[PDB]
Amino acid sequence: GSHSMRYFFTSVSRPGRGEPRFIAVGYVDDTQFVRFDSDAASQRMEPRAPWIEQEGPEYWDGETRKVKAHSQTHRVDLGTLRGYYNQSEAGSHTVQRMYGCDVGSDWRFLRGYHQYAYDGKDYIALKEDLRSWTAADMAAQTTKHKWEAAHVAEQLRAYLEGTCVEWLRRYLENGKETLQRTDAPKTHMTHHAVSDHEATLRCWALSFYPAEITLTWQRDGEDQTQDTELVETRPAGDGTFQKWAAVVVPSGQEQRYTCHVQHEGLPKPLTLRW
């Protein structure tokens, strides 16, 4: 299947005292591998996966220099955006940035992206062609004119189709023992009487990787959404994910219901029945 490298950046202004809080996180697929936190002691890009610890001092010095440069750009942007939106110095504001690249099933460049938000709303985004911008409002249109004149899309296109996919492929090889391993969901069903007449069936998917999964209930072989509940996929904390789906059924009719589990680690989807 496809693989992704993504970097996430958050800056939050602190009008009471001092400079913005800045947090940067790097992922390959659903695995965090690096972090930077302005509040942490190291003031360095830090490893968060064993397979990145391989990289030598030049790597860590280079990533530390770039992530600190990113933090200064975000600090300046918080000032610029306060200006564009005519906001007071008194309030806290947030900038968010996410960029990265996907390789396809053929291990070649598939797509690139670079998205920016102010106070949790779309600001400016690089379009799929990596040659044009989506500006949400007239502040973002000002940025779009600046970035057109500075050929920012050309700069990002070179990174996204070059360095980004080359280093994604390097990480995927260095970390292959985990990054290129699928963990199929461990599935089971629980049964909970809700009354004398009704039971809840809960279909569990545990310890799976990557996070993408589909749980569906059928009754007599037809999809059922009525009287179902599906929780948001959640992290286990050990790098794997969890999800459950539940349905309320008439007691004694449990055998009519099947839970269908779709995941990259399953050659064929699993069917569970009480």
């Binding site: 790097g26 280079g62 942007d77 610029t80 940025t143």
Partner: peptide, 9 residues
């Protein structure tokens, strides 16, 4: 690997 430059908005 991070991008080398971040141009301001």
């Amino acid at each position: 690997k991070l991008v080398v430059v971040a141009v301001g908005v």
